[PDB]
């Protein structure tokens, strides 16, 4: 199609730059400047809104394209093959076109607010400046093709079941774990501290399992889960804690997403994460909250998962 | 005997409830409500007094019964066999009967003071309520049989050697390590943070080695060590630190207990604990005190253990 | 030679004491009393000045003697063989004689200022007092022989290249990493907390690789690197941070030292250290500074090492 053909031209203009970027740099785990949790949450919210509006089949295709790309990484910089680079850009171009322009610009505007003005210059300083410029020009040409195919209105909200077994169980899980949820420091920078002894390539293989799971999940269930998070962000208090009702809706929605893929797909994610998560991490998190409430939340979770397991 | 026969009936009434309890829940490592170190210490003191008054042979028998019970654990809830459940209840019933009623009630009263009123309800909410009630009724019947065989007066204090080699060495160890003892935060909740990466079943196998060692130890030496701790609790200051003289008496008493079992029994405990203790734990403890005093205490300990080793 | 012959007599008088010292005691990692970072830095500075003035070939010989001595350690106290003890004392005696008396006394005076008056007594209390006294008398006799051979003037400063590839690269590394250097708490006691799960004998084998590397390094490059550190100490601010220019000079000097030994020698040090450094240590250090600046410093380092690698 058009976007696919345009992606090939984008590749001719940008692959040199892609080969120069040090993709294994740990700096990408950090905020693009000073961390501002609540301001960053507004940007995440715009992305969630956009994700919920995008075509589920195109999102699925874009996830598969990244899974394929991870398989061809090579060299010390961790760059994917030229064919995969084009495949990813085409798939993302299609996703962008499935959403109205204002949604895309909202993301750009909110991310700009939290990005330090010096970030682009520092990033360009690590590569060949001419190649970066050449890549950007390629991008400007590519976005015109995407724009021509872009829709003018957003698709409607997902269908949410009511009173299903998962929804009822999620209510019990939520009441039991809300005290624990309120104790977590949602505004801490600890979440961006790296995993001890794990390289970027090791982390990538674990993230790959999640990408694969997302590609397999029910598109509507995923869309509803994103919508539930957007609503939850609207009710947060000053410390970032959402309302008990919105928390319950988020848990029910996630339970339906889990039940939409086979058990083996979910276990692959768990096993991969268990391989990269130092045992001191769960302990460090546990030590910052009330130990009775953490155990109450955990017991409720192991009870809730039996209902999800039966539906799955 | 009577208690043995009554334990079998207690089992018919309570084993269903025992099978329902999730014994692997980590909540049991936590205080039954808000942690109140000094108030909890009063309850531990009542238990120590009771332990020192109990018949040493019956305490030994009850420890052996638990060691046997650990060997038959099965299922996801970690429940011991019906035969072992009865064996444990009978052995404990006999221990309770070897101590006067007021001592037993003192424990109950002091533990009630630190237990949150909502604890029993929360525990009952996780099992079949009817089965719990049935188990409690079984307990009320069982305690009447125990009461009929209960002594009316407490046995006398243990015999403590004087000026033996261990007692003299303990004096040197105590003088050398008291500065370190004073620096430890005895009122901290860090002691109840779980062992990183260790399941309840793994911890249980390590605790089993200690139970085995206790069953092998000299009953009089154990009794004297408990009495020494009761005295030490009497002289604590506002931060929970006992007097130097009481500390020395505790060290001498523990040294005698160690020398009452063969070296292999003590090494089995050490090796099992080494297997479940993350190397960051000793470091975390060390970092909270004066490093010179911790090394002075450690050097004194490695010197003291040579005297215990020779006596053993 | 004279010092060699005198070392043999020193050995007859001191080896008994050497066998009694518990060399595996972790107390030697701690300051000899209360930690006083800035006062201790003055003592290190005197040692640096002395090291830069000593004969490079004699320093190299003394390093080799320690490497040999590590190979003959035996027993629970970690004592080297009698032959190696003498070899070490002789080699050190020769180093001491290659430097003027005032430099040696300066070290003694500055170390005395930070050492608690009770340290010698505590150390003597752990060994046979008569043997310690006998060893000290042996030392007093030995130092007279060293004194007779001692030079009267210090050798001149090392020759430093200018505008070489390493020097230019060091400038870029220093500019990129200075913000990170300023954020580190140079006055913290964390640097003296032990390595989790690593015995003194395990640490010794890792330190052995560094001793071997130092013995292989270019004597002039080492001398220049020591001189660069002495200058750097002169420009520190109140928090212990040296000037940007002195920092750059230190980096260039160290880069030349690294390029003066083959790659395999440097990798042996890295592999040995990787074996004793818990993965939580780099994380703990990273969590105390700005994460963006740490990643910028790291990226700059991986770029700088390519220039060192080519020169090597
Ligand atoms: C644990 C939690 C998980 C984490 C959560 C997710 C993390 C979210 C944070 C992501 C951080 C993104 C930061 C990367 C910055 C890259 C933006 C870029 O370099 O920006 C470069 C631009 C270009 O600047 C240029 O500056 C000038 C130079 O161009 C000139 O030069 C020539 C080519 O060289 C051309 O011919 C051009 O026409 C000519 O004018 C011109 O004005 C250009 O038109 C242009 O404006 O800078 C600008 O716009 C201004 C800067 C804008 C700020 C960044 C927003 C834009 C892109 C990000 C939004 C997408 C969302 C990302 C996250 C979603 C997925 C994770
Ligand atoms: C550790 C490691 O190894 O990680 C490895 C992981 C991988 C995955 C293997 C890997 C890879 C590949 C990667 C990351 C590729 C990333 C590609 C990103 C493409 C992003 C695109 C196209 C974004 C857009 C946004 C658009 C917006 C367009 C508009 O808003 C514009 C402008 C103006 C509006 O008026 C109109 C508009 C039309 C609305 C556009 O049209 O397109 C790599 C490199 O190997 C690294
Ligand atoms: C198309 C699209 O865009 O997709 C995008 C969609 C998203 C959602 C945005 C996205 C994402 C993120 C994803 C998928 C997250 C996935 C999370 C999965 C979590 C799974 C968990 C917790 C699984 C487990 C399994 C466990 C098992 C525990 C036990 O067995 C144990 C050990 C021992 C037994 O004795 C008992 C037991 C208790 C039984 C456990 O306890 O937990 C992504 C990647 O961006 C892609
Ligand atoms: C900065 C900021 O303020 O952020 C704010 C952002 C928000 C969004 C507003 C906000 C919020 C709400 C949040 C985060 C809620 C998160 C909820 C997460 C729920 C996750 C769930 C249910 C995961 C699972 C995984 C499951 C796996 C089940 C199985 O694998 C198991 C075990 C065993 C297998 O044998 C069977 C199986 C079935 C395969 C399951 O059953 O369920 C908050 C708190 O306000 C913070
Ligand atoms: C992680 C894990 O797997 O852990 C596993 C570990 C094991 C060991 C294998 C295991 C097990 C077994 C367990 C815990 C059994 C516990 C049994 C406890 C029995 C307690 C008893 C009888 C207590 C009492 C107290 C009494 C008091 C009586 C009186 O005061 C009363 C009322 C009134 C006074 O007027 C008179 C009185 C007479 C003075 C009584 O008479 O009796 C299990 C379940 O498998 C879990
Ligand atoms: C009937 C009854 O009720 O019984 C009850 C009685 C109690 C008491 C209440 C009870 C209990 C608790 C018990 C038993 C506690 C037992 C504690 C044992 C501690 C043992 C220790 C520290 C052993 C060691 C061994 C070590 C060895 C170190 C070395 O070898 C090492 C590595 C390397 C060599 O080169 C040097 C070395 C230095 C030689 C070490 O350094 O330490 C229980 C369970 O409730 C039951
Ligand atoms: C909250 C509250 O306030 O709590 C307060 C409670 C108190 C009680 C009032 C209180 C107090 C005092 C306390 C805790 C004192 C604790 C003393 C513990 C002493 C432990 C000892 C000696 C253990 C051992 C183990 C030994 C093992 C020896 C061997 O294995 C070794 C190595 C090697 C083998 O080859 C040979 C061996 C021989 C087999 C040994 O030789 O000795 C305080 C501080 O006030 C706090
Ligand atoms: C964990 C472990 O196992 O570690 C193991 C590591 C090893 C290396 C294997 C090991 C070993 C060996 C060791 C440490 C040996 C150390 C020897 C130290 C010797 C130091 C010497 C001679 C120092 C001096 C200083 C002198 C100063 C002399 C003067 O100033 C004096 C007075 C007065 C002035 O007027 C004149 C003067 C002339 C200027 C002197 O003349 O001599 C061991 C023991 O096995 C432990
Ligand atoms: C005669 C005399 O007195 O000598 C005295 C002289 C001194 C100087 C005072 C002295 C001393 C101290 C000494 C020698 C210090 C030595 C320090 C050596 C540091 C070496 C380092 C950092 C080496 C590395 C190697 C690395 C490799 C990283 C990578 O390969 C990795 C993993 C993975 C690849 O994919 C990428 C990669 C990135 C390539 C790394 O990242 O770092 C001593 C002992 O007192 C003796
Ligand atoms: C208490 C107090 O205040 O202290 C004050 C003391 C001071 C001194 C005044 C002060 C200061 C300055 C300081 C500490 C600066 C320290 C700089 C250290 C630089 C170390 C460097 C360059 C090490 C290396 C190692 C290298 C290894 C390279 C390789 O192995 C690599 C990777 C991979 C192989 O394949 C190839 C290779 C080539 C073999 C290299 O390339 O470089 C400060 C800050 O003021 C604090
Ligand atoms: C159901 C579900 O799971 O959904 C999940 C799905 C996902 C995908 C996993 C997910 C996600 C992430 C999301 C949506 C990412 C969104 C990315 C959006 C990028 C937008 C970009 C780059 C927009 C712009 C706009 C630009 C404008 C540039 C110009 O106008 C400017 C200024 C000025 C000049 O005059 C002209 C110009 C030069 C043209 C441009 O430069 O770029 C999420 C949140 O997890 C939800
Ligand atoms: C030498 C040495 O090593 O000793 C060591 C030995 C050990 C064993 C390891 C050790 C230990 C722990 C110890 C001693 C545990 C003691 C447990 C005691 C439990 C006591 C209980 C349950 C008592 C009660 C009383 C109750 C009363 C109930 C009723 O009256 C009530 C309210 C009102 C109604 O009208 C009638 C009623 C319903 C009848 C009941 O409900 O329960 C220690 C401390 O380590 C020392
Ligand atoms: C190029 C490079 O890499 O260099 C590196 C090389 C090294 C070696 C690795 C290095 C290092 C460390 C250094 C230099 C160590 C220096 C040690 C010096 C020790 C000096 C001592 C013991 C001096 C004294 C003086 C004393 C005086 C005693 C007496 O006068 C007293 C009071 C009073 C009586 O009346 C007479 C008396 C009894 C006679 C004595 O008792 O002892 C460094 C810093 O890393 C740099």
Q: Which of B50, B53, B210, B297 to mutate to test the pocket of ligand 6 (most atoms within 8 A of CB)?
A: B210
- Could you give phi then psi for residue C79, rounded to 5 degrees? -90, 140
| Cα(C281) to centroid(ligand 12), Å | 46
Cα of A46 to nearest chain C Cα, Å: 25
Cβ-defined contact of B299 to C27 (cutoff 8 Å): yes
Q: Measured between alpha carbons, how far is residue B240 from residues A96, B134, B184, C44, C121 in Å?
A: 65, 42, 10, 41, 32
Report the candidate in C163, C179, C183 with the shortest Cα–Cα distance to residue C171.
C163
Q: Is A197 on the interface with B (CB under 8 A)?
A: no
Query: Is residue A208 within 8 Å of A276, Cβ to Cβ?
Result: no
CB-based burial of residue B267 (10 Å sphere; 0-12 exposed, 13-18 middle, 19+ buried)?
exposed
Within this chain, do residues A202 and A288 fall inside the same structural domain, yes or no? yes
CA–CA separation, A167 and A176 (whole Å): 15
CB atoms within 10 A of CB B188: 12
Number of domains in chain C: 2
Query: Is residue B252 within 8 Å of B166, Cβ to Cβ?
Result: yes
DSSP B159: P
Determine which of C281, C283, C287, C306 to mutate to test the interface with A (most A C-beta atoms within 10 Å): C283
Contact list in B for residue A287 (CB cut-off 8 A) is 193
| Cα(C230) to centroid(ligand 1), Å | 46
Report the candidate in C244, C229, C240 with the shortest Cα–Cα distance to residue C44.
C229
Method by which the model was determined: X-ray
Within this chain, do residues C129 and C174 fall inside the same structural domain, yes or no? no
CA–CA separation, B214 and B226 (whole Å): 12
Determine which of B278, B280, B283 to mutate to test the interface with C (most C C-beta atoms within 10 Å): B283
DSSP A51: H
Within this chain, do residues B161 and B298 fall inside the same structural domain, yes or no? yes
Question: Which CATH number does the domain housing residue B149 bear?
Answer: 1.40.10.10
Q: Which residue range forms the structural domain that includes residue C105?
A: 1-155
CA–CA separation, C42 and C242 (whole Å): 14
Query: Is residue B60 within 8 Å of B215, Cβ to Cβ?
Result: yes
Determine which of C20, C24, C30 to mutate to test the interface with B (most B C-beta atoms within 10 Å): C30
Cβ-defined contact of B126 to A299 (cutoff 8 Å): yes
What crossing angle do the helices spanning C82-97 and C56-70 adopt, rounded to 10°? 160
Alpha-helical regions (H) of A54-199: 56-70, 82-97, 101-114, 119-125, 129-149, 165-183
Identify the helix (H) or strand (E) that includes residue A227.
Answer: helix A219-234
Query: Is residue A77 within 8 Å of A204, Cβ to Cβ?
Result: no
- Could you give phi then psi for residue C286, rounded to 5 degrees? -60, -40
- Could you give phi then psi for residue B74, rounded to 5 degrees? -155, 165
Report the candidate in A93, A92, A116, A114 with the shortest Cα–Cα distance to residue A46.
A114
Kindly provide the b/e burial profile for residues C196-217, where b requires at least 16 CB atoms within 10 angstroms of the residue's own CB.
beeeeeebeebbbbebbbbbeb
DSSP B191: G
Residue carrying structure tokens 């032990």: C194
Report the candidate in B235, B249, B230 with the shortest Cα–Cα distance to residue B161.
B249
Within this chain, do residues B39 and B88 fall inside the same structural domain, yes or no? yes
Sign of the dihedral defined by the CA atoms of residues C303, C306, C307, C312, in that order: positive
Query: Is residue C179 within 8 Å of C293, Cβ to Cβ?
Result: yes
Contact list in A for residue B27 (CB cut-off 8 A) is 292, 295-296, 299
Within this chain, do residues C192 and C207 fall inside the same structural domain, yes or no? yes
Within this chain, do residues A91 and A162 fall inside the same structural domain, yes or no? no
CB atoms within 10 A of CB C261: 20
Give, using CA atoms, the residue closest to atom 5 of ligand 9: C214
CB-based burial of residue C41 (10 Å sphere; 0-12 exposed, 13-18 middle, 19+ buried)?
middle
Q: Which of A235, A236, A285, A303 to mutate to test the pocket of ligand 4 (most atoms within 8 A of CB)?
A: A236
Cα of A197 to nearest chain C Cα, Å: 6
| Cα(C85) to centroid(ligand 8), Å | 10
DSSP string for chain C: -HHHHHHHHHHHHHHHHHHHS-TT-GGGGS-SSS--HHHHHHHHHHHHHHHHHS-HHHHHHHHHHHHHHHTT-BTTTTBPPHHHHHHHHHHHHHHHHTS-HHHHHHHHHHHHHHS-TTHHHHHHHTS-HHHHHHHHHHHHHHHHHHHHH--SSPPPPPP---S-HHHHHHHHHHHHHHHHHHHS-TT-SGGGSPPTT--HHHHHHHHHHHHHHHHHS-HHHHHHHHHHHHHHHHT--TTSPPPHHHHHHHHHHHHHHHTTS-HHHHHHHHHHHHHH--THHHHHHHHTS-HHHHHHHHHHHHHHHHHHHHH-
Tokens at B3, concatenated:
């208690």
Tokens at B189, concatenated:
């909740």
Cβ-defined contact of A26 to C298 (cutoff 8 Å): yes
- Give the three-state DSSP class for B175: helix
Please identify, among A126, A155, A184, the residue that sits at the C-terminal boundary of a domain. Answer: A155
Determine which of B20, B21, B30, B34 to mutate to test the interface with A (most A C-beta atoms within 10 Å): B30
Is A305's C-beta closer than 6 angstroms to any atom of ligand 4?
yes
CA–CA separation, A62 and B260 (whole Å): 70
Query: Is residue A171 within 8 Å of A230, Cβ to Cβ?
Result: no
Query: Is residue A50 within 8 Å of A106, Cβ to Cβ?
Result: yes
CA–CA separation, A196 and C11 (whole Å): 47
Within this chain, do residues C109 and C194 fall inside the same structural domain, yes or no? no
| Cα(A92) to centroid(ligand 2), Å | 7
Give, using CA atoms, the residue closest to atom 31 of ligand 4: A305
| Cα(B304) to centroid(ligand 11), Å | 69
Q: Measured between alpha carbons, how far is residue B122 from residues A113, B23, B117 in Å?
A: 47, 15, 10
DSSP A27: G
Q: What's the length of chain C? A: 312
Cβ-defined contact of C292 to A22 (cutoff 8 Å): no
Sign of the dihedral defined by the CA atoms of residues A127, A128, A134, A137, in that order: positive
Query: Is residue C140 within 8 Å of C80, Cβ to Cβ?
Result: no
Q: What is the resolution of this structure in A?
A: 2.0
Residue carrying structure tokens 């410029």: A133
Report the candidate in B6, B277, B301, B272 with the shortest Cα–Cα distance to residue B177.
B301
CA–CA separation, B135 and B11 (whole Å): 8
The CA dihedral of C237, C240, C244, C249, to the nearest 10 degrees, is: 120
DSSP string for C64-99: HHHHHHHTT-BTTTTBPPHHHHHHHHHHHHHHHHTS
Query: Is residue B183 within 8 Å of B285, Cβ to Cβ?
Result: no
Cβ-defined contact of C295 to A22 (cutoff 8 Å): no
Q: Which residues contact B30 (CB under 8 A, 6 or more apart)?
A: A291, A292, A295, B192
Report the candidate in C269, C274, C272, C267 with the shortest Cα–Cα distance to residue C312.
C267
Kindly provide the b/e burial profile for residues B150-161, where b requires at least 16 CB atoms within 10 angstroms of the residue's own CB.
beeebeeebebe
Please identify, among C155, C176, C208, the residue that sits at the C-terminal boundary of a domain. Answer: C155
Report the candidate in B94, B85, B95 with the shortest Cα–Cα distance to residue B12.
B85
| Cα(A156) to centroid(ligand 1), Å | 30
Query: Is residue B91 within 8 Å of B140, Cβ to Cβ?
Result: no
- Enumerate neighbours of A (3 or more CB pairs within 8 A): B, C
CA–CA separation, C55 and C43 (whole Å): 20
Q: Which ligand is nearest to the CA of C241?
A: 10
Cβ-defined contact of C299 to A22 (cutoff 8 Å): yes
Q: Which residues contact C223 (CB under 8 A, 6 or more apart)?
A: C52, C56, C157, C158
Please identify, among A91, A123, A155, the residue that sits at the C-terminal boundary of a domain. Answer: A155
Query: Is residue B163 within 8 Å of B43, Cβ to Cβ?
Result: no
Cβ-defined contact of B26 to A298 (cutoff 8 Å): yes
Minimal Cβ distance to A280: which of B122, B192, B196: B196
Within this chain, do residues C9 and C110 fall inside the same structural domain, yes or no? yes
Tokens at B188, concatenated:
């901290």
Q: Which residues contact A122 (CB under 8 A, 6 or more apart)?
A: C296
Within this chain, do residues B137 and B194 fall inside the same structural domain, yes or no? no
Helix (H) and strand (E) counts in chain B: 14, 0
Q: Measured between alpha carbons, how far is residue A52 from residues A41, A98, A230, A254, B59 in Å?
A: 16, 11, 9, 14, 65
Minimal Cβ distance to C292: which of A30, A197, A280: A30
Identify the helix (H) or strand (E) that includes residue A49.
Answer: helix A37-53
Within this chain, do residues A93 and A231 fall inside the same structural domain, yes or no? no
CA–CA separation, C195 and B279 (whole Å): 9
Identify the helix (H) or strand (E) that includes residue B119.
Answer: helix B119-125
Report the candidate in C211, C209, C203, C212 with the shortest Cα–Cα distance to residue C276.
C203
- Could you give phi then psi for residue A79, rounded to 5 degrees? -95, 140
What crossing angle do the helices spanning B200-216 and B56-70 adopt, rounded to 10°? 150
Within this chain, do residues B105 and B210 fall inside the same structural domain, yes or no? no
Tokens at A8, concatenated:
């090939």
Q: Which residues contact C9 (CB under 8 A, 6 or more apart)?
A: C138, C141, C142
Give, using CA atoms, the residue closest to atom 35 of ligand 6: C76
Q: Is C197 on the interface with A (CB under 8 A)?
A: no
Is A14's C-beta closer than 6 angstroms to any atom of ligand 4?
no
- Enumerate neighbours of B (3 or more CB pairs within 8 A): A, C
Within this chain, do residues B177 and B70 fall inside the same structural domain, yes or no? no
Q: What's the length of chain A? A: 312
Report the candidate in A303, C237, C222 with the shortest Cα–Cα distance to residue B126.
A303
Q: Measured between alpha carbons, how far is residue C136 from residues B122, C10, C88, C239 in Å?
A: 70, 9, 17, 39
What crossing angle do the helices spanning C291-311 and C244-258 adopt, rounded to 10°? 40
Cα of B197 to nearest chain A Cα, Å: 5
Q: Which residues contact B162 (CB under 8 A, 6 or more apart)?
A: none
CA–CA separation, B281 and B289 (whole Å): 13
CA–CA separation, A144 and A96 (whole Å): 12
């Amino acid at each position: 199609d058009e976007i696919g053909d345009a992606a090939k031209k984008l590749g001719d203009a940008s692959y040199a730059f892609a080969k120069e970027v040090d993709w294994n740099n740990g700096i990408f785990l950090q905020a693009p400047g000073k961390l501002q949790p609540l301001e960053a949450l507004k940007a995440i919210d715009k992305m969630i809104v956009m994700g919920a509006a995008a075509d589920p089949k195109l999102l699925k295709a874009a996830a598969e394209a990244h899974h394929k790309a991870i398989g061809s990484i090579s060299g010390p910089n961790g760059v994917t093959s030229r064919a995969d680079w084009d495949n990813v850009n085409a798939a993302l171009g299609r996703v962008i076109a499935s959403v109205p322009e204002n949604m895309v610009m909202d993301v750009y505007d909110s991310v700009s607010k939290i990005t330090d003005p010096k970030v682009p210059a520092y990033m360009k300083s690590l590569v060949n400046g001419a190649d970066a410029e050449k890549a950007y020009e390629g991008f400007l040409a590519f976005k015109d093709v995407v724009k021509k195919s872009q829709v003018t209105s957003a698709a409607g909200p997902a269908t949410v079941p009511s009173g299903d077994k998962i929804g009822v169980a999620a209510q019990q899980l939520s009441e039991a774990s809300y005290p624990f949820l309120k104790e977590i420091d949602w505004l801490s920078d600890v979440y961006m501290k790296p995993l001890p002894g794990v390289s970027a390539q090791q982390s990538l293989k674990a993230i790959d399992k999640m990408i694969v799971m997302g590609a397999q999940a029910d598109g509507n269930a995923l869309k509803a889960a994103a919508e539930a998070h957007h609503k939850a962000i609207g009710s947060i208090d000053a410390t970032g804690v959402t309302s008990a009702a919105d928390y319950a809706a988020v848990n029910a929605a996630l339970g339906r997403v889990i039940a939409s893929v086979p058990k083996s797909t979910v276990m692959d994610v768990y096993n991969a994460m268990a391989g990269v998560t130092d045992t001191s991490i769960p302990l460090n998190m546990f030590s910052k909250v009330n130990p009775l409430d953490a155990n109450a939340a955990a017991k409720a979770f192991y009870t809730f998962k039996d209902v999800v397991q039966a539906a799955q």
